[PDB]
């Protein structure tokens, strides 16, 4: 009853892909820019790093706010949190508002992890930052940090409901990156090299 | 032509009141109503959920065909979603003695607008958890559904369908409304709602 309310709320809140809303009022069509993704990385290409950080924060919140409510209400080992965090990420990937055409859910998933464990969230973000500074592919950093986020929760002793949530979310994130994976293997992925950040 | 076939099929399918047919499957016959709530009443939540899903599908299935084959702007969809609910309210297979059409109407709005449907389901859950009457939640979620379709800018064929379907549902709750105002409506326990 109460759990169903929270899970649906997490899905509806997650369905507000804020990169698509902000770019629309700024006039930009994200479909034609860079990867075509509606997420923070492509919002940065289309609108600049000022709007990319804003979109990252909002997409972060819609996974953090519902997951935190589940933790305080049902406990960290409740499967309500499992499906709440999944709902926020599935809302971002398949938004009920925009015809189920959303992003890859990396920022929203980090919001869910933050509500479960800030410690793991900051480490995974540090892992994401290093891999990115290393190779300047956001997709490679996101894939790596997604896998490291799962390994961090496991070693830290988090319950099987949290691990199940992380596996499904992580497997969904990698699957939504299959276009980036195809581009990385073929040397076509949109790098953030010298020319890209300069211009 | 083919539009009339869909409307009549929507009515006939909606006339399959599923609590009944699944109550008689397992073999049971309180409120005496044909509803998912009245099936959880009797055979447990696991069968009332299935009955809710089936009554949901008979409104969802013909309405999705209307959207896909005629368009969300078509008035074929208006009469198709109307026929499904009217089938559930006045089932030709059961002497026109049927339920209140909440689950069937939710199926109709979900095929038209998955967003409005889930938003209206949020309204129902909140009102039910807050005040603990099933009927008060169904009336409020019905009204909010039309308001959600209106402010979102859905076409006039959909707004007309929601008004007529909403009015029918509210009208089917006239006995619930009387008992609500006279304090004779059943209410769930303060703890019974959370374990519901
Ligand atoms: C299971 C929990 C996993 C948590 C996720 C890992 C944390 C990563 C740190 C946050 C990084 C900032 C947010 C970026 C969101 C985003 O935009 O993701 C899409 C990118 O990838 C690929 O971008 P693109 O080239 O446009 O497809």
Residue numbers in the entry:
A (entry chain B): 1 to 199
B (entry chain A): 1 to 29, 34 to 200
Authors' description from the paper:
In bacteria, two distinct G3P acyltransferases (GPATs), PlsB and PlsY, catalyse the committed step. By contrast, the recently identified membrane-integral PlsY exists exclusively and ubiquitously in bacteria, and uses an unusual acyl donor, namely the acyl-phosphate (acylP), representing a unique class of acyltransferase. PlsY acylates G3P using acylP, forming lysoPA and inorganic phosphate (Pi). The overall shape of aaPlsY resembles a funnel composed of three tilted helices (α1–3) sitting in a cup composed of seven TMHs.
As shown in the aaPlsYlysoPA structure, the phosphate group of lysoPA is located in the phosphate clamp, which is the same site for Pi/3. Thus, the path for Pi release is blocked by lysoPA, suggesting that the lysoPA liberation is requisite for Pi release. Our structures show that lysoPA interacts with all G3P-binding residues, and forms three additional H-bonds to backbone amides of Ala40 and Thr41, and the Thr41 hydroxyl. Furthermore, its hydrocarbon tail is anchored in the hydrophobic groove as seen for 16 : 0-P binding. Therefore, lysoPA should bind to PlsY with much higher affinity than does for G3P, featuring a competitive inhibitor. The release of the product inhibitor is probably driven by high concentrations of the substrates. In addition, the exiting Pi along the Pi-release path might aid the lysoPA clearance by electro-repulsion and competing for the phosphate clamp site.
